[PDB]
Amino acid sequence: AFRPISVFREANEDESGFTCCAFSARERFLMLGTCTGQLKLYNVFSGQEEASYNCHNSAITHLEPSRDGSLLLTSATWSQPLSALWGMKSVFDMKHSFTEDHYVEFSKHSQDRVIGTKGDIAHIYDIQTGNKLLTLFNPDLANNYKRNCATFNPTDDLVLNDGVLWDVRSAQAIHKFDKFNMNISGVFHPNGLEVIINTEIWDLRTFHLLHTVPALDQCRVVFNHTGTVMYGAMLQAKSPFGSSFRTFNATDYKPIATIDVKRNIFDLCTDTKDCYLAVIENQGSMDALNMDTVCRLYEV
Ligand SMILES: NC(=O)C[C@H](NC(=O)c1c[nH]c(-c2cnn(CCN3CCOCC3)c2)c1-c1ccc(Cl)cc1F)c1ccc(F)c(Cl)c1
Structure with missing residues (x-):
């Protein structure tokens, strides 16, 4: 089954803006993109934010960490550049970007x-x-x-x-x-x-x-x-x-x-051990105009 395990939202924000997710190479941590173009690191069980980074000047649509933990791909909505590659060792920094x-x-x-x-x-x-x-x-x-x-x-x-x-x-x-x-x-x-x-x-x-x-x-x-x-x-x-x-x-x-889930879905990912599923869901009724997403964690 898919038993709900935990839920969290973008800490301290009137309107939670999670848009995408991927489990980090680092166990216990989820990476989330937001509608303001930030990358957040969350401790997935406590639901607490640990770090935040600025990536794009528009909503992150998708992200992908490299298996080795060293690199991250991001894509956005309206930014130039629309996608970018980030280094994640020592200093979070943009390595390269991919214009359009x-x-x-x-x-x-x-x-x-x-x-x-x-x-x-x-x-x-x-x-x-x-x-x-x-x-x-x-x-x-x-x-x-x-x-x-x-x-x-x-x-x-x-x-x-x-x-x-x-x-x-x-x-x-x-x-x-x-x-x-x-x-x-x-x-x-x-x-x-x-x-x-x-x-x-x-x-x-x-x-x-x-x-x-x-x-x-x-x-x-x-x-x-x-x-x-x-x-x-x-x-x-x-x-x-x-x-x-x-x-x-x-x-x-x-x-x-x-x-x-009776709510609009933004994204879904599983962890490297296929123990957990994380789903980003908009709260409210179906096709709510209000953007107020949560991340739900399900036990596979
Ligand atoms: N992270 C993953 O790879 C899992 C995968 N998620 C996705 O594919 C996306 C999440 N947000 C998106 C997403 C959000 N916005 N957009 C459109 C962004 N525009 C593209 C054109 O240029 C302007 C921006 C895609 C996409 C997306 C949609 C379509 C295309 Cl062709 C390409 C994608 F990456 C997924 C797999 C199975 C599932 F059951 C669920 Cl719920 C999700």
């Missing part, structure tokens, strides 16, 4: 690169120099997904951008997956064998359609660290998500649970 990329992720196997998304276009950057290594855009193969988000595969040799599979080393598009929806561009399963693009599960080897999973329609997904469970939440047609998230067995795509 509104989404960024680390590479997966070795976290030496950043992949940023601007619309239908992917940009790959070197973490050391900040230099743009690659622009990935193929006018013949584009799907023009409205919520595109480029991503590396588990071994970093492939990228999926706009439903197109790229060989990174050669910088060539090797396959376009056919379009079935307007918005969602897809992710790699952690198993290395499958691509999940909205409701379609494709085999990487053959490019054959393996499964259709209707419940994944319009969902962002994240897997637990062991890659046994997949969490999905449907984007809203303001909070990025509706009031529900769903779990699925990552091995067979069979559903496990649907959780309706």
